[model samples]
Target chain A: AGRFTKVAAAVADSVVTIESVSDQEGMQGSGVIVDGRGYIVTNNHVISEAANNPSQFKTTVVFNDGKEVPANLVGRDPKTDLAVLKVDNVDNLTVARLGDSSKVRVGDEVLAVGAPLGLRSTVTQGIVSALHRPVPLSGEGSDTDTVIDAIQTDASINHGNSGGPLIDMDAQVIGINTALGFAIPVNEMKLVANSLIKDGKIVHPTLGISTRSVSNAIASGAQVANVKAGSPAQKGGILENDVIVKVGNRAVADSDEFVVAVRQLAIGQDAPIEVVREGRHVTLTVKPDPDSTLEH
Target chain B: AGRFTKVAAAVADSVVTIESVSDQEGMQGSGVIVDGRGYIVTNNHVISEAANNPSQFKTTVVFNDGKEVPANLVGRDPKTDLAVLKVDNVDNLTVARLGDSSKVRVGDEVLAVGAPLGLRSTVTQGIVSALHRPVPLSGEGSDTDTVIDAIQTDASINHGNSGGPLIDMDAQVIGINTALGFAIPVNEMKLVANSLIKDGKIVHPTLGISTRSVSNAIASGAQVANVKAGSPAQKGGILENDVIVKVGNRAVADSDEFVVAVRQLAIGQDAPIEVVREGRHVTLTVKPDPDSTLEH
Candidate 1:
């Protein structure tokens, strides 16, 4: 009781409420300070519309002491649905310590702190409901949407609760963004957030093809629906209606799996793509495209 | 990791799946071994139909080792939504240790184990999402129904997950009957199960009055709807439409609150009841009837 009560109390100050207004339509979410210089990590969708149209939007960060400060959108990566914000001239900020998401277990205790349903500083408690729960997150659009092996919790989560911190017993932030308790692991968040802080965005390796899950007696994989004209997929001779069997060395069981496997490839590196085309198994080697103009 | 992995492995075998079939309709739930001599405790509604019509229905328990045995309903008390079952010729059984649920706090780690959706030995992890959560559970009917101070968990739960053991970090049973995770505390389970084991039934202290929560500027209390004839409520001059303000030394804020307060009364002991009747405050003395023939 003392430990749990102790953890929630000390770490609660770092949990902040974020509000984004675009065209008089407002969205509320939660965030955690990850830097003493006033840098915050929250879900991209939390401030999606506002960040998309910066001139017509107003973003504000509310600290625990009821102080509200204007924030600037540092960067956004739709592939992970993650965004970074920085508040200038803020001091004595409480930064959250991130934990190793790779060590997260199903039965471990977790606390989710956020502004659920517009209620600020709400702390909901629960446990890690599941590990590597595959989830396809909805965001800017399907083309840029992310599919992740999410950490699921039984913690009370809702719309405003999104972008909050999922804290472990050690007062470490394990993940972020929750609803029915699906959190993008902090390991994933760190990779995306670090890139955003340094380069203003995250670029993922990709094969520009639209696909969906397809299954039959012979096999099950991702069925290619559309291929971008000048993309690496077309350059590698990947055609529409092709059932992608594997990417690199990983099996593509479904569209989400296909997206996950392809995203892990190193940019400009050559990898073999396996597909079944009209009763024939075909293999194609193509270098991944590091296209900043295209979103995965 | 060692502690969590160790705890789940030790307690999994003690959780059993209970099935009750009535008129071709089957209901499945879970339970835990409370006694070494084949005694199990589960939610009353789990085996309600079979127990209510014992001749036409059937009940069985499926243990962790896949041993299925017939079980007999020893006793059921809907007032607490608890039931006891007994099996014969069962040996080398794993009996679950009962924990002191009074020490349970929100944010403490908890595990919910059961057969969810017919998947046996399924253990879902979570934490105490809330404490003293008030919930109105549906059952046999209104008169015999009970209201309890329920423990809310964010653990994964479903129809078949009901009546499962909510285990603590110490591998002890903390609560039971979780669906969307509202559990009756193990403390309550101990009292009801002990009574059922001793006398085959639990008689409660009652006021014999139907009431619902009412709120107004003048006061907020339980409005008496109907007083049972010749019952303590009627004999004490309690009338319909009289808003009960207090029961004994406890304030009745709502109907659920009223039920909980009255159930705590000492049987056959006189306590003063305060009520607001047509803008007048009146006090009356009532001795709660230790009525075995009546259900609270």
Candidate 2:
């Protein structure tokens, strides 16, 4: 328990309990303050109710010292299930340092700090259960809000544990807790949070086509569900029901890879796209929208 | 890519493809040479068929140089799902260094070297997905043969990848791949392999009581399912249905803790056991059987 005490004390002030109230229900979760200026990182679902029905719901943060402060959603990415909240009039906040996720291994010790069962400042200890777990968002029937890859733990994550911090032995925050007790990797989360802070949204390079995976394994194609009218695909003479076989020079496996490939390309940059259409293989150059952003 | 090539090349000689022909069926797996004297470590399942029906099945070890050597099973521990084999009349074996699993962390880059899809000397790279994953063995329906803790990875551990070495950046073997692609921690595997080599079987300390977890989360108790007649638990006045709450002075939550606690105690030493029975708490001193070994 020596490691536990050290980590819990180090992160005590940075982790805060979150309470969200909607029209018919109230919910509780957790968050980690990542900036001295009062920017707290949490799960988008934790504040989704308040964000969706603003006037009828309220969101507040409670610090370790029992001080309560109102927090406003700066921005959120439902695709990654992460949100950034800003609390004004807060002073001397203890900000958490983010650890490099690339350095994490399978047997590292970790702690989950949250308000499980409304118990404030609670800490549970466990090792990394599994990493890179692809968690699917429920009732959506799509990839929207799906945590593409997540970290799994057995640290007794309960109700109100969502949006908490999954901290390392050094008290550094490595992940933000989501539903199912999954935490988004801090490395990836840092990139998204920075963009959210800078532009109030995540900017993406888009092919402007709905796609479904053609196979389960890598190197498979993504079947085009529909091509948006006058979008990159349509503008490049691409059609519906065409299977995207490659992007740039890499072979495409599934829609996830397709999405990742398009997201990596710069907006307004032309990319060579390969597709299998009507028993013929075709290559086309498509330029993404300059102002393209993540859709849902 | 640089890291991948270096690790793969470094571990090439240490990793070997294993083929076992049993009962008119052929099976392929992998192994790692842990000693220049020809001791190879692998999964128990990889050699189980050959060990059980030696007359009907033959086991062979194939090196990266394409030389096939007949192998004989030294010993195996089903509880840990590990086996040690010896190949006679072999020269210039490259032994692998073992890494400390206690020092492993989540997100550390790892590589799995084995024969997947019967392709010898295949290497797949990924980060440590999770650690200390409690994997249970089939046929036992209990913890009798359960690998108490194992390493989880996403390094594409496919068919024929079992028994290969899970190597780290330092080219040190951290685990041996299993059927589920789970690898036993090298730290734990080393202990079992040494014992197997010495005794030709595993020797376990027995508490002589069947236990089950009484609750979930921390501070939970381990319920005594049954106590062996004339055994340690019964001799110490530990009744059935008694909840074991502490071993010696340490509070235990769940059977996992209890198992760990019992395993750590010296075989002939007496330990104070705290139990909750019939709404009353009691303490008992139980000295495990001097000749006690793990009971299936």
Candidate 3:
């Protein structure tokens, strides 16, 4: 078989079309089987309604061989927009190998496999368009209004493509398809998935302040726009209009860089955030919420 | 030295930031020295106003050591958005090695060297985001609105970065950066450059049809939007809304595929185009215009 054929065949059995039906909306998406015991990985938005409003809908997974099985929501993390599902009593389910996202670079050939517009087993080819793009989700200021560092691909992803796999040329899953074809890296996905499967929830470090990139206008930092009440920033005396210059001695050029630095912080750890306030430099200690799902 | 440092050092001398100044607007871009005698390749838009209205403006090439030289526009092709420049009285100018774009793949590391926002000789690291992207240029329906199959990179290309080199890890120039950082594949760039240098213009085969892809809403085919007046498609009796299925035994699923097939056709050759018209399958002969620069 040719390269495309080889890749298509290798992952065909691992990808499945998922139909999420709610009273108000019927959505179709795709997923990859990650465990032979029927544990699957997909985008959080794929089964968001089922997770958010439990009795409002049902989800069914359609395998390549036309086998249909009802899937139970294992756990989901809206921060990363990844979710895990379990289908009972399925035998010999083919599982896909996950690749390290850090190893993925641009110019690598990749395949996006899923059901696009209800077309089953559709395969589209493209290369990694970009990496580490701090993409903001659609629902701004909501719980899901989160920014994720994503691996970008221009592989013709449309509706019904969310939750599919963005596989490298070697047939390893490096990303899980999300909005506009941005993917949560499999490494990050795996981290969230393992935590979700274990505790039914994923904990993340967060600094409770919304910021805007003020680098171009202000020369070198992010301006804090809003601070959540009683949250880390507010409790730590981080005020609005304060320009955050550094997080733990690392200079942050924009809000994206700040988030990246914040995500690297351990939960419950106190980090000194240096800020320029009214022409005076000050350091404030902020501790991330230990058991929080706060979207940073 | 590290990999990035090594790559940056290898191509530093060959890459030059360009400043095209006109009475109305001052534009900053970049270019790659392709010949030791001071021949450079840059995007057409970088010097478009200068080329169109020569007496009102001038272009300058700035070397790494801050040496600046006045460059003369040798030739430009708006269809490819590429221009060649020559600087007289320049000696020992470093030139770049053009690489075969076919060898570039996703995940390959690339260095985008240019003067982004006038930061001279700035190097940004990224991977080739994609390949064979049919990117449409500005000035639609005009000579400059031609579609080019481009290589996409996430290497932070910005204003003043156009016409720089997108070099491989081997320091070979695989592409010339444009807005969004699309590169004219060195293979295509070389062909156009050679023709432009030899004849002061580039020639291309034309099918003379405006087409739209009808695959998603319909099936796999290109819907003929318009047949150019007195051109090949018009002379061949191809009509509007005719769904083109094949071009010389190669199935064309969309306009891009049709263009790829048509570009491969030699000038003055009569190729059979299979189309479905008015519920009837028909074949028409399209002879590409000889000695034509008509934009396809």
Q: Which model scores highest in DockQ?
A: 1
Which sections of candidate 2 miss by over 4 Å?
Answer: A1-94, A97-136, A139-296, B116-122, B129-133, B139-144, B152-158, B216-221, B245-253, B274-283, B290-296
Best by TM-score: 3
Worst 10 residues of 1 chain B by lDDT: B114-123
TM-scores of all predicted structures: 0.56, 0.56, 0.60
Q: C-alpha displacement of A107 in model 3, angstroms?
A: 21
- Classified by CAPRI criteria, candidate 2 counts as incorrect
Q: Over 4 Å off in model 3, which ranges?
A: A1-95, A98-175, A180-296, B115-121, B140-143, B215-217, B245-253, B256-261, B278-283, B291-296
Tell me how large the interface RMSD of candidate 2 is.
12.0
Query: DockQ: which is higher, 1 or 3?
Result: 1
| Model 1 alpha-carbon drift over 4 Å, by segment | A115-121, A140-144, A215-217, A237-242, A276-283, A293-296, B2-123, B126-154, B158-296
Cα shift from native, residue B139, model 3 (Å): 3.7
Per-residue lDDT tens digits of candidate 3, residues A1-296? 34554675688788887776664455568888998888899887777777666676678888979887898888887767788998998998889998999999987887776642243223556788898877766531234666678988876555435688888878999998885357788999989899888888787777788899885444458899999888988888899999898887567778877876677677777899998888788899998774355532
Query: lDDT of all predictions, in order shown?
Result: 0.80, 0.74, 0.77
For each candidate, the DockQ is 0.08, 0.02, 0.02
Query: What is the lDDT ranking, best to worst?
Result: 1, 3, 2
In candidate 2, position B49 carries an lDDT of 70
